[PDB]
Short mmCIF file of N, CA, C and O and ligand atoms in Angstrom, two decimals:
data_model
loop_
_atom_site.label_atom_id
_atom_site.label_comp_id
_atom_site.label_asym_id
_atom_site.label_seq_id
_atom_site.Cartn_x
_atom_site.Cartn_y
_atom_site.Cartn_z
N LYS A 1 108.07 87.66 23.63
CA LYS A 1 108.94 88.25 25.11
C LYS A 1 108.39 87.05 26.08
O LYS A 1 107.07 86.64 26.34
N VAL A 2 109.50 86.82 26.90
CA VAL A 2 109.19 85.86 27.86
C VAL A 2 109.33 86.94 29.35
O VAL A 2 110.34 87.55 29.42
N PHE A 3 108.29 87.15 29.84
CA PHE A 3 108.15 87.98 31.04
C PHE A 3 108.68 87.19 32.56
O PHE A 3 108.49 86.10 32.42
N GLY A 4 109.43 87.99 33.32
CA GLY A 4 109.57 87.77 34.43
C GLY A 4 108.11 87.64 35.07
O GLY A 4 107.21 88.34 35.04
N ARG A 5 108.28 86.99 36.34
CA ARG A 5 106.73 86.89 37.38
C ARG A 5 106.47 88.35 37.80
O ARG A 5 105.23 88.58 37.51
N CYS A 6 107.51 89.12 38.17
CA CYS A 6 107.12 90.49 38.80
C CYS A 6 106.78 91.26 37.74
O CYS A 6 106.08 92.10 37.73
N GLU A 7 107.47 91.42 36.68
CA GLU A 7 107.47 92.13 35.59
C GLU A 7 105.93 91.94 34.88
O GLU A 7 105.29 93.08 34.73
N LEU A 8 105.38 90.72 34.84
CA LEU A 8 104.10 90.57 34.40
C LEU A 8 103.20 91.09 35.10
O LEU A 8 101.78 91.70 34.88
N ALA A 9 103.23 90.71 36.54
CA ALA A 9 102.38 91.20 37.37
C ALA A 9 102.23 92.80 37.38
O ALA A 9 100.82 93.27 37.30
N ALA A 10 103.14 93.43 37.20
CA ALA A 10 103.31 94.87 37.05
C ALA A 10 102.69 95.30 35.65
O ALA A 10 101.69 96.26 35.83
N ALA A 11 102.81 94.64 34.67
CA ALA A 11 102.03 94.93 33.42
C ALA A 11 100.51 94.65 33.58
O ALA A 11 99.88 95.46 33.22
N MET A 12 100.34 93.52 34.31
CA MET A 12 98.80 93.41 34.15
C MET A 12 98.03 94.32 35.12
O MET A 12 96.88 94.72 35.02
N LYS A 13 98.71 94.65 36.40
CA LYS A 13 98.26 95.79 37.02
C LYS A 13 98.10 96.85 36.55
O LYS A 13 96.88 97.56 36.54
N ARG A 14 99.09 97.27 35.72
CA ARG A 14 98.97 98.61 35.01
C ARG A 14 97.74 98.49 34.10
O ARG A 14 96.97 99.53 33.99
N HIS A 15 97.33 97.62 33.30
CA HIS A 15 96.26 97.26 32.44
C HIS A 15 95.00 96.95 33.26
O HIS A 15 93.94 96.47 32.53
N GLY A 16 94.73 97.13 34.75
CA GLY A 16 93.42 96.93 35.03
C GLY A 16 92.95 95.59 35.48
O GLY A 16 92.02 95.33 35.86
N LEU A 17 94.00 94.61 35.24
CA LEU A 17 93.51 93.02 35.72
C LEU A 17 93.73 92.78 37.37
O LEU A 17 92.83 91.97 37.58
N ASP A 18 94.27 93.74 38.27
CA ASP A 18 94.27 93.47 39.82
C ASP A 18 92.97 93.49 40.18
O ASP A 18 92.31 94.86 40.06
N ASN A 19 92.30 92.59 40.62
CA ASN A 19 90.77 92.43 41.00
C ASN A 19 89.49 92.35 40.12
O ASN A 19 88.92 92.89 40.41
N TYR A 20 90.19 92.56 38.65
CA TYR A 20 89.10 92.46 37.48
C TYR A 20 88.04 91.46 37.77
O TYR A 20 88.33 90.31 37.80
N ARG A 21 86.91 91.94 37.78
CA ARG A 21 85.65 91.05 38.21
C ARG A 21 86.03 89.91 39.52
O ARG A 21 85.56 88.86 39.41
N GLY A 22 86.77 90.73 40.40
CA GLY A 22 86.94 90.01 41.62
C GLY A 22 88.25 88.89 41.74
O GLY A 22 88.49 88.26 42.62
N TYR A 23 88.68 88.94 40.46
CA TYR A 23 90.11 87.84 40.55
C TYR A 23 91.31 88.69 40.75
O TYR A 23 91.84 89.54 39.89
N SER A 24 92.06 88.55 41.79
CA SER A 24 93.05 89.20 42.33
C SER A 24 94.46 89.02 41.28
O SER A 24 94.26 87.88 40.45
N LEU A 25 95.37 89.87 41.37
CA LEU A 25 96.26 89.77 40.32
C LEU A 25 96.85 88.47 40.47
O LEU A 25 97.46 87.91 39.00
N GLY A 26 97.17 88.00 41.58
CA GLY A 26 97.75 86.50 41.79
C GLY A 26 97.19 85.48 40.80
O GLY A 26 97.95 84.57 40.18
N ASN A 27 95.91 85.59 40.62
CA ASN A 27 95.27 84.55 39.61
C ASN A 27 95.60 84.56 38.39
O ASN A 27 95.77 83.66 37.65
N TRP A 28 95.54 85.84 37.81
CA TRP A 28 96.24 86.00 36.46
C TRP A 28 97.46 85.67 36.07
O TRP A 28 98.01 85.19 35.05
N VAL A 29 98.47 85.89 37.10
CA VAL A 29 99.90 85.58 36.99
C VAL A 29 99.90 84.07 36.65
O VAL A 29 100.67 83.47 35.79
N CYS A 30 99.28 83.68 37.84
CA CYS A 30 99.10 82.11 37.75
C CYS A 30 98.67 81.39 36.57
O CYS A 30 99.23 80.56 36.09
N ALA A 31 97.62 81.91 36.15
CA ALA A 31 97.05 81.68 34.83
C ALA A 31 98.00 81.56 33.66
O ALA A 31 98.52 80.52 32.71
N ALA A 32 98.89 82.79 33.64
CA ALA A 32 99.58 83.00 32.56
C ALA A 32 100.95 82.17 32.55
O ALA A 32 101.55 81.34 31.65
N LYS A 33 101.47 81.77 33.93
CA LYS A 33 102.60 80.90 34.17
C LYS A 33 102.25 79.31 33.50
O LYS A 33 102.92 79.06 32.69
N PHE A 34 101.07 79.03 33.51
CA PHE A 34 100.74 77.76 33.54
C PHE A 34 100.02 77.63 31.87
O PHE A 34 100.31 76.70 31.25
N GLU A 35 99.70 78.65 31.55
CA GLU A 35 99.08 78.64 29.84
C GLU A 35 100.19 78.67 29.10
O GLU A 35 100.32 78.05 27.87
N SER A 36 101.05 79.65 29.29
CA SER A 36 102.26 80.26 28.40
C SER A 36 103.75 80.10 28.96
O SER A 36 104.61 80.64 28.05
N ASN A 37 103.74 79.80 30.12
CA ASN A 37 105.11 79.98 30.78
C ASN A 37 105.60 81.54 30.70
O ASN A 37 106.86 81.72 30.53
N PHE A 38 104.69 82.33 30.67
CA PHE A 38 104.91 83.97 30.42
C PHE A 38 105.49 84.41 29.13
O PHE A 38 106.20 85.23 29.22
N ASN A 39 105.41 83.64 28.18
CA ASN A 39 105.56 83.69 26.77
C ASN A 39 104.65 84.35 26.02
O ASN A 39 103.61 83.54 25.78
N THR A 40 104.78 85.60 25.36
CA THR A 40 103.68 86.13 24.70
C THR A 40 103.61 85.21 23.34
O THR A 40 102.38 85.50 22.67
N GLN A 41 104.43 84.62 22.80
CA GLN A 41 104.44 83.99 21.49
C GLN A 41 103.98 82.56 21.59
O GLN A 41 104.03 81.94 20.56
N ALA A 42 103.65 82.06 22.79
CA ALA A 42 103.18 80.76 22.83
C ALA A 42 101.79 80.55 22.03
O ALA A 42 101.08 81.50 22.03
N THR A 43 101.64 79.54 21.22
CA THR A 43 100.79 79.00 20.28
C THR A 43 100.63 77.90 20.71
O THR A 43 101.38 76.58 20.94
N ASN A 44 99.19 77.13 20.75
CA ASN A 44 98.97 75.65 20.83
C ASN A 44 97.73 75.38 19.97
O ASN A 44 96.77 76.09 20.29
N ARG A 45 97.87 74.30 19.40
CA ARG A 45 96.75 73.93 18.36
C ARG A 45 95.72 72.82 19.29
O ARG A 45 96.31 72.08 19.77
N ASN A 46 94.61 73.13 18.99
CA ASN A 46 93.51 72.27 19.74
C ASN A 46 92.88 71.02 18.80
O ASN A 46 93.11 71.63 17.52
N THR A 47 92.52 70.17 19.34
CA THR A 47 91.81 69.15 18.74
C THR A 47 90.80 69.34 17.68
O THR A 47 90.92 68.96 16.37
N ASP A 48 90.18 70.52 17.86
CA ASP A 48 88.95 70.89 16.96
C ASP A 48 89.52 72.11 16.17
O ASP A 48 88.87 72.39 15.24
N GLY A 49 90.82 72.10 15.80
CA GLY A 49 91.44 72.92 14.86
C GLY A 49 91.69 74.28 15.15
O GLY A 49 92.00 75.25 14.42
N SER A 50 91.01 74.77 16.59
CA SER A 50 91.38 75.90 16.90
C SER A 50 92.66 76.29 17.32
O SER A 50 93.49 75.09 17.57
N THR A 51 93.05 77.18 17.62
CA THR A 51 94.50 77.58 18.33
C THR A 51 94.40 78.43 19.31
O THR A 51 93.59 79.42 19.24
N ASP A 52 95.19 78.34 20.28
CA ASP A 52 95.35 79.28 21.66
C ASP A 52 96.72 80.09 21.44
O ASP A 52 97.69 79.65 20.88
N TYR A 53 96.44 81.32 21.79
CA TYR A 53 97.67 82.40 21.32
C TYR A 53 97.84 83.19 22.42
O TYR A 53 97.14 83.77 23.14
N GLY A 54 99.15 83.30 22.79
CA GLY A 54 99.63 84.33 23.58
C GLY A 54 99.50 83.86 24.99
O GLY A 54 99.61 82.74 25.40
N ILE A 55 100.14 85.08 26.10
CA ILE A 55 100.28 84.90 27.20
C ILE A 55 99.21 84.07 28.09
O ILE A 55 99.49 83.68 28.92
N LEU A 56 98.03 84.52 27.71
CA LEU A 56 96.70 83.68 28.17
C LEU A 56 96.29 82.87 27.30
O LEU A 56 95.01 82.51 27.77
N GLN A 57 96.74 82.37 26.06
CA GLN A 57 96.30 81.41 25.19
C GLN A 57 94.96 81.35 25.04
O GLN A 57 94.21 80.59 25.32
N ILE A 58 94.70 82.66 24.35
CA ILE A 58 93.27 82.85 24.00
C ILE A 58 92.85 82.08 22.69
O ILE A 58 93.56 82.04 21.89
N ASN A 59 91.65 81.53 22.69
CA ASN A 59 91.30 80.54 21.82
C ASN A 59 90.57 81.23 20.57
O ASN A 59 89.77 82.26 20.53
N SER A 60 91.04 80.79 19.25
CA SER A 60 90.64 81.30 18.12
C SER A 60 88.93 80.91 17.74
O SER A 60 88.58 81.42 16.79
N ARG A 61 88.45 79.81 18.69
CA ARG A 61 87.12 79.44 18.06
C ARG A 61 86.33 80.71 18.37
O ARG A 61 85.30 80.55 17.75
N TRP A 62 86.45 81.26 19.51
CA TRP A 62 85.62 82.30 19.72
C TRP A 62 86.01 83.55 19.80
O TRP A 62 85.36 84.48 19.62
N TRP A 63 87.37 83.97 20.03
CA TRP A 63 87.84 85.07 20.80
C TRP A 63 88.54 85.93 19.57
O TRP A 63 88.61 87.27 19.70
N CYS A 64 89.15 85.27 18.61
CA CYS A 64 89.99 86.02 17.66
C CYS A 64 90.04 85.48 16.19
O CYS A 64 89.55 84.29 16.20
N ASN A 65 90.52 86.16 15.21
CA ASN A 65 90.51 85.47 14.00
C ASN A 65 91.99 85.30 13.72
O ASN A 65 92.79 85.95 13.66
N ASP A 66 91.95 83.87 13.23
CA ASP A 66 93.49 83.46 12.73
C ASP A 66 93.24 82.93 11.10
O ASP A 66 94.08 82.68 10.62
N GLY A 67 92.06 83.34 10.67
CA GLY A 67 91.72 82.72 9.07
C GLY A 67 91.75 81.51 8.82
O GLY A 67 91.77 81.08 7.77
N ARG A 68 91.99 80.54 9.74
CA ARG A 68 91.79 79.36 9.71
C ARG A 68 91.23 78.22 10.81
O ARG A 68 91.23 77.12 10.89
N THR A 69 89.77 78.91 11.28
CA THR A 69 89.23 78.43 12.30
C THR A 69 87.87 78.27 11.81
O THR A 69 86.98 79.20 12.31
N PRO A 70 87.36 77.48 10.88
CA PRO A 70 86.04 77.47 10.26
C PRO A 70 84.84 77.58 11.20
O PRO A 70 84.95 76.82 12.24
N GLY A 71 84.05 78.59 10.72
CA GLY A 71 82.97 78.52 11.86
C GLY A 71 83.25 79.24 13.28
O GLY A 71 82.55 78.93 14.19
N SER A 72 84.10 80.05 13.30
CA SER A 72 84.73 80.50 14.37
C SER A 72 84.25 82.07 14.85
O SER A 72 83.85 82.66 13.57
N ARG A 73 84.23 82.62 15.84
CA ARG A 73 83.61 83.77 16.15
C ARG A 73 84.95 84.46 16.28
O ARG A 73 86.19 83.66 16.32
N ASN A 74 84.95 86.06 16.22
CA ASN A 74 86.00 86.74 16.61
C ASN A 74 85.36 87.78 17.46
O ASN A 74 85.50 88.76 17.28
N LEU A 75 85.11 87.31 18.87
CA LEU A 75 84.46 88.55 19.72
C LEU A 75 85.29 89.35 20.12
O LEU A 75 84.78 90.21 20.98
N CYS A 76 86.73 89.26 20.40
CA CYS A 76 87.56 90.22 20.63
C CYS A 76 87.87 91.16 19.72
O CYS A 76 88.70 92.17 19.87
N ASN A 77 87.39 90.79 18.31
CA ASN A 77 87.75 91.87 17.11
C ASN A 77 89.12 92.19 16.93
O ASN A 77 89.63 92.91 16.61
N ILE A 78 90.03 91.02 16.77
CA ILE A 78 91.18 91.40 16.59
C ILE A 78 92.06 90.22 16.10
O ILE A 78 91.42 89.03 15.98
N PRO A 79 92.91 90.48 14.98
CA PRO A 79 93.44 89.20 14.72
C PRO A 79 94.39 88.36 15.73
O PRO A 79 95.05 89.11 16.73
N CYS A 80 94.53 87.05 15.64
CA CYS A 80 95.01 86.13 16.80
C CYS A 80 96.40 86.70 16.89
O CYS A 80 96.96 86.58 17.98
N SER A 81 97.27 87.13 15.74
CA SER A 81 98.39 87.42 15.94
C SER A 81 98.70 88.55 16.70
O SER A 81 99.66 88.68 17.30
N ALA A 82 97.72 89.48 16.92
CA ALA A 82 97.86 90.54 17.97
C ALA A 82 98.12 90.16 19.30
O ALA A 82 98.43 90.93 20.12
N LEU A 83 97.33 88.76 19.72
CA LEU A 83 97.85 88.30 20.95
C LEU A 83 99.13 87.91 21.37
O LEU A 83 99.65 87.62 22.31
N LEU A 84 100.11 87.91 20.20
CA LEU A 84 101.43 87.46 20.48
C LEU A 84 102.45 88.50 20.73
O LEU A 84 103.90 88.07 20.87
N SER A 85 102.08 89.62 20.79
CA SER A 85 102.81 90.86 20.90
C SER A 85 103.74 90.96 22.14
O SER A 85 103.27 90.39 23.21
N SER A 86 104.74 91.54 22.20
CA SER A 86 105.45 91.55 23.72
C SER A 86 104.32 92.83 24.50
O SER A 86 104.58 92.74 25.63
N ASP A 87 103.59 93.39 23.83
CA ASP A 87 102.64 94.48 24.39
C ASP A 87 101.52 93.59 24.57
O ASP A 87 100.95 93.11 23.70
N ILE A 88 101.24 93.21 25.95
CA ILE A 88 100.11 92.40 26.26
C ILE A 88 98.74 93.18 26.40
O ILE A 88 97.76 92.48 26.76
N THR A 89 98.65 94.48 26.01
CA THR A 89 97.35 95.35 25.82
C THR A 89 96.10 94.30 25.27
O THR A 89 95.08 93.96 25.81
N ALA A 90 96.59 93.64 24.08
CA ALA A 90 95.23 93.06 23.53
C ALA A 90 94.99 91.82 24.20
O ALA A 90 93.77 91.67 24.22
N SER A 91 95.67 91.04 24.55
CA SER A 91 95.65 89.86 25.21
C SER A 91 94.81 90.38 26.55
O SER A 91 93.86 89.83 26.92
N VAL A 92 95.27 91.34 27.55
CA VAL A 92 94.51 91.93 28.60
C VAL A 92 93.10 92.04 28.32
O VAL A 92 92.34 91.86 28.89
N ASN A 93 93.19 93.01 27.21
CA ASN A 93 91.49 93.55 26.92
C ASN A 93 90.96 92.25 26.54
O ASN A 93 89.50 92.50 26.79
N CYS A 94 91.08 91.41 25.91
CA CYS A 94 90.49 90.29 25.39
C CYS A 94 90.09 89.61 26.55
O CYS A 94 89.02 88.95 26.93
N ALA A 95 91.09 89.30 27.40
CA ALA A 95 90.81 88.43 28.64
C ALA A 95 89.79 88.97 29.54
O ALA A 95 88.81 88.36 30.06
N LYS A 96 89.66 90.32 29.69
CA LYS A 96 88.56 91.17 30.50
C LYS A 96 87.11 90.62 29.74
O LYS A 96 86.16 90.30 30.46
N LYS A 97 87.06 90.67 28.53
CA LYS A 97 85.60 90.10 27.76
C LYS A 97 85.62 88.66 28.16
O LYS A 97 84.36 88.22 28.49
N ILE A 98 86.33 87.88 28.19
CA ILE A 98 86.24 86.67 28.26
C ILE A 98 85.75 86.17 29.64
O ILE A 98 84.89 85.65 30.03
N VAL A 99 86.59 86.97 30.84
CA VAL A 99 86.12 86.78 32.10
C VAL A 99 84.90 87.24 32.47
O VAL A 99 84.23 86.75 33.38
N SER A 100 84.45 87.96 31.57
CA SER A 100 83.19 88.60 31.88
C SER A 100 82.10 87.90 31.45
O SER A 100 80.93 88.09 31.57
N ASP A 101 82.34 86.94 30.63
CA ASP A 101 81.17 86.21 29.82
C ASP A 101 80.15 85.16 30.59
O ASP A 101 79.70 84.14 29.83
N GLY A 102 80.23 85.01 31.74
CA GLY A 102 79.70 83.81 32.67
C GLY A 102 80.34 83.07 33.41
O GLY A 102 79.96 82.90 34.61
N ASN A 103 81.58 82.54 33.03
CA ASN A 103 82.32 81.59 33.63
C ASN A 103 83.54 81.93 34.57
O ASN A 103 84.32 81.28 34.88
N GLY A 104 83.92 83.45 34.53
CA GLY A 104 84.90 84.20 34.97
C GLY A 104 86.27 83.20 34.46
O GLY A 104 86.36 82.95 33.39
N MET A 105 86.91 83.13 35.20
CA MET A 105 88.33 82.26 35.10
C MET A 105 88.29 81.01 34.61
O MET A 105 89.45 80.43 34.31
N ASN A 106 87.33 80.33 34.92
CA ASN A 106 87.09 78.90 34.53
C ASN A 106 87.12 78.70 33.07
O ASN A 106 87.51 77.64 32.87
N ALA A 107 87.09 79.79 32.63
CA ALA A 107 87.40 79.76 30.93
C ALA A 107 88.68 79.32 30.82
O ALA A 107 89.09 78.64 29.75
N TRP A 108 89.87 79.45 31.63
CA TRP A 108 90.94 78.91 31.62
C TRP A 108 91.31 77.54 32.28
O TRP A 108 91.33 77.74 33.39
N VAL A 109 91.24 76.55 31.38
CA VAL A 109 91.44 75.47 31.90
C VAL A 109 92.36 75.25 33.08
O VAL A 109 92.48 74.69 34.02
N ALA A 110 93.64 75.93 32.74
CA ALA A 110 94.75 75.63 33.61
C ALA A 110 94.64 76.59 34.77
O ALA A 110 95.24 76.13 35.84
N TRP A 111 93.94 77.65 34.88
CA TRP A 111 93.59 78.20 35.86
C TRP A 111 92.67 77.52 36.93
O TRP A 111 92.97 77.00 38.03
N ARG A 112 91.64 76.61 36.20
CA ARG A 112 90.86 75.88 37.19
C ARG A 112 91.52 74.90 37.85
O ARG A 112 91.29 74.40 38.98
N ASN A 113 92.41 74.01 36.79
CA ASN A 113 93.11 73.17 37.36
C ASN A 113 94.37 73.26 38.10
O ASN A 113 94.66 72.33 38.83
N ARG A 114 94.97 74.27 38.14
CA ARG A 114 96.36 74.48 38.71
C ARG A 114 96.46 75.69 39.71
O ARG A 114 97.60 75.96 40.21
N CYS A 115 95.39 76.70 39.70
CA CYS A 115 95.76 77.76 40.43
C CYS A 115 94.28 77.95 41.17
O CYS A 115 94.30 78.28 42.43
N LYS A 116 93.26 77.60 41.01
CA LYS A 116 91.82 77.36 41.52
C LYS A 116 92.02 76.97 42.80
O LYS A 116 92.52 75.89 42.72
N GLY A 117 91.75 77.72 43.88
CA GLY A 117 91.89 77.08 45.37
C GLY A 117 93.14 77.10 45.71
O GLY A 117 93.62 76.41 46.89
N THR A 118 94.25 77.35 45.02
CA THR A 118 95.74 77.64 45.65
C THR A 118 95.87 78.80 46.03
O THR A 118 94.88 79.61 46.23
N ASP A 119 97.15 79.27 46.96
CA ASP A 119 97.18 80.39 47.22
C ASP A 119 97.78 81.23 46.21
O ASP A 119 99.37 81.01 45.76
N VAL A 120 97.03 81.61 45.41
CA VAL A 120 97.98 82.49 44.21
C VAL A 120 98.48 83.66 44.44
O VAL A 120 99.21 84.08 43.87
N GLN A 121 98.07 84.19 45.78
CA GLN A 121 99.06 85.62 46.24
C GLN A 121 100.39 85.18 46.28
O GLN A 121 101.30 85.98 46.06
N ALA A 122 100.95 83.86 46.26
CA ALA A 122 102.40 83.55 46.26
C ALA A 122 102.97 84.08 44.88
O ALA A 122 103.85 84.40 44.75
N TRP A 123 102.08 84.22 43.70
CA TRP A 123 102.70 84.42 42.38
C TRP A 123 103.13 85.76 42.27
O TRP A 123 103.87 86.17 41.47
N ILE A 124 102.56 86.67 43.25
CA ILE A 124 103.05 88.28 43.09
C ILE A 124 103.78 88.64 44.32
O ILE A 124 104.23 89.67 44.60
N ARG A 125 104.11 87.60 45.21
CA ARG A 125 104.79 87.68 46.75
C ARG A 125 106.48 88.19 46.35
O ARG A 125 106.89 87.69 45.27
N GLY A 126 106.90 89.28 47.02
CA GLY A 126 108.10 89.70 46.87
C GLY A 126 108.07 90.89 45.64
O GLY A 126 109.14 91.62 45.28
N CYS A 127 107.09 90.97 44.72
CA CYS A 127 106.96 92.01 43.65
C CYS A 127 106.84 93.34 44.36
O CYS A 127 105.76 93.50 44.96
N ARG A 128 107.77 94.28 43.62
CA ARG A 128 107.20 95.53 44.00
C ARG A 128 106.18 96.16 42.94
O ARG A 128 106.41 96.25 41.90
N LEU A 129 105.12 96.14 43.48
CA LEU A 129 103.93 96.69 42.87
C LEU A 129 103.16 98.06 43.32
O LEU A 129 102.30 98.65 42.58
CL1 LIG B 1 88.56 81.72 10.77
CL1 LIG B 2 95.85 72.06 33.39
NA1 LIG B 3 96.91 85.92 25.40
NA1 LIG B 4 87.81 83.01 15.05
#
């Protein structure tokens, strides 16, 4: 499913991301924009053989099992394919573990490069939340 900007904001708000570990909702929207263009079915293969899955491009080296990332962990205890669902619950709950793991949202390269230090509130502006 390809979300609208406001629709995703609303889904993410309902799932407890709004200010989770101090990151306002705009940050999460901005990250999703640039990670996946709001498409839950986004996948991208990394140099190391790991793959990024879903709206927040969660990586199989640590966070999910795709059965093909030798030597990887599955720290969110989910199959990676669960991150591709139109229901963002699994992506959101795994994101919460990731963002709590010491690096905050710097774990998402695109957030660090495209969102961090920008006016992220722009991403939820105009939305009925
Ligand atoms: Cl694996
Ligand atoms: Cl980037
Ligand atoms: Na995801
Ligand atoms: Na894995």
